[PDB]
UniProtKB/Swiss-Prot annotation:
It is an enzyme of class 3 (hydrolase). N-Glycosylated. Addition of a bisecting N-acetylglucosamine by MGAT3 blocks lysosomal targeting, further degradation and is required for maintaining stability under stress conditions. Acetylated in the endoplasmic reticulum at Lys-69, Lys-218, Lys-222, Lys-228, Lys-242, Lys-243 and Lys-250. Acetylation by NAT8 and NAT8B is transient and deacetylation probably occurs in the Golgi. Acetylation regulates the maturation, the transport to the plasma membrane, the stability and the expression of the protein. GO terms for molecular function: amyloid-beta binding; aspartic-type endopeptidase activity; beta-aspartyl-peptidase activity; endopeptidase activity; enzyme binding; peptidase activity; protein serine/threonine kinase binding. The chain holds residues 58 to 446 of 501 of the full protein. Coiled coil: none annotated. This is Beta-secretase 1.
Length: 389
């Protein structure tokens, strides 16, 4: 398809998130909203805050409805809480429709709004099962589909720059596209390969094999989905279950041993810097994640480059060095295919057919020698067994 008005409607970067412009209330109050496939609540700052340039003023909206109910959302490092209500919502560079949706007006938060991120709310695109307070609070996308004829699917092309962007550059640049209700062929190359959404809560999938430069990690595949495996645009890193993480890092270190990096680099805590333009991409291996296909006993793989898993960070120093952080870290809640992974591909969240498609992104960062890839099919047996219970 071709949904030209929605192409390039995102701004942001992997470390801080990608967001789309939305309006809430009457008259319209414009806000920048983080696109998050890892959660299911539509929530916006509703009170002044040091890191918010603007916020939702319910008292100024004539269509605001109070649901007289509070909502609390805690997470690893911080949280937000607020008051539930509904209002009219639109997406300026989205389909030309206006919907009444649940809105969590954030009254208090800790380590939620990030300095300089520029988004003032979050758009939880996942399913009702994980919405807060409970699954009766209908998610935004569900209200959108119910109230309009927008097809039940959206697609995301998150575009990392491959280098640090200052405040001015993020504001003045295109960070990608969120095509609501369709697929735009200019956003990818090659073919789209689909993997089933295992269950509708998070956008859960099943990984059946992992390779580091073609070499099989060779772990029992259930380890790869230990707990669950999800696609999450609201998380920066590629997160891996502890056992998988330890095996992956051992292998990545082995492939890159011509250079040694401090432990803090591998812990994703400290940056590594190389003189301008000399980042040794070639010593780092590519990483392939094989996903269960739609055809019985068939699988396909997506391959990412170090240009995806090494996240650019500015060297606040006065050097012209190119610096990065290792964007692969351990998880205790399963595999998380975050932003640095999504930056390599055009990702289709086909809710209507309960599947997620992957294609090489037309804007993925690469070099002259290697490119990210999506290839298949591969004959694979007993993949259902890779799922955890």
């Amino acid at each position: 398809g071709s949904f030209v008005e929605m192409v390039d409607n995102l701004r942001g970067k992997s470390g801080q998130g990608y967001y789309v412009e939305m309006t809430v209330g009457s008259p319209p109050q414009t806000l920048n909203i983080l696109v998050d496939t890892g959660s299911s609540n539509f929530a916006v700052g509703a009170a002044p805050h040091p890191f918010l340039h603007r916020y939702y003023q319910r008292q100024l909206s004539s269509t605001y409805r109070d649901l007289r109910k509070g909502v609390y959302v805690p997470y690893t490092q911080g949280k937000w809480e607020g008051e539930l209500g509904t209002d009219l919502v639109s997406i300026p560079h989205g389909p030309n429709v206006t919907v009444r949706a649940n809105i969590a007006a954030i009254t208090e938060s800790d380590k939620f709004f990030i300095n300089g991120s520029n988004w003032e709310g979050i758009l939880g695109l996942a399913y009702a099962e994980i919405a807060r307070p409970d699954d009766s609070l209908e998610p935004f996308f569900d209200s959108l589909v119910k109230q309009t004829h927008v097809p039940n699917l959206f697609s995301l092309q998150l575009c990392g720059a491959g280098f640090p962007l200052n405040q001015s550059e993020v504001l003045a640049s295109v960070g990608g596209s969120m095509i609501i209700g369709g697929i735009d062929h200019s956003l990818y190359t090659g073919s789209l390969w689909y993997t089933p959404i295992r269950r509708e809560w998070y956008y859960e999938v099943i990984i059946v094999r992992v390779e580091i430069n073609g070499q099989d990690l060779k772990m029992d595949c259930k380890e790869y989905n230990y707990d669950k495996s999800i696609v999450d645009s609201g998380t920066t890193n590629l997160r891996l279950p502890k056992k998988v993480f330890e095996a992956a890092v051992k292998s990545i270190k082995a492939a890159s041993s011509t250079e040694k990096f401090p432990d803090g680099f591998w812990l994703g805590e400290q940056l590594v810097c190389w003189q301008a333009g000399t980042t040794p991409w070639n010593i780092f291996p590519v990483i392939s994640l094989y996903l269960m296909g739609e055809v019985t006993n068939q699988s396909f793989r997506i391959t990412i480059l170090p240009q995806q898993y090494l996240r650019p960070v500015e060297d606040v120093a006065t050097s012209q060095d190119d610096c990065y952080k290792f964007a692969i870290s351990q998880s205790s809640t399963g595999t998380v295919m975050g932003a640095v992974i999504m930056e390599g591909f055009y990702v289709v969240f086909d809710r209507a057919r309960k599947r997620i498609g992957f294609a090489v992104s037309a804007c993925h960062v690469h070099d002259e020698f290697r490119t990210a890839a999506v290839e298949g099919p591969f004959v694979t047996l007993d993949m259902e067994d890779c799922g955890y219970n």
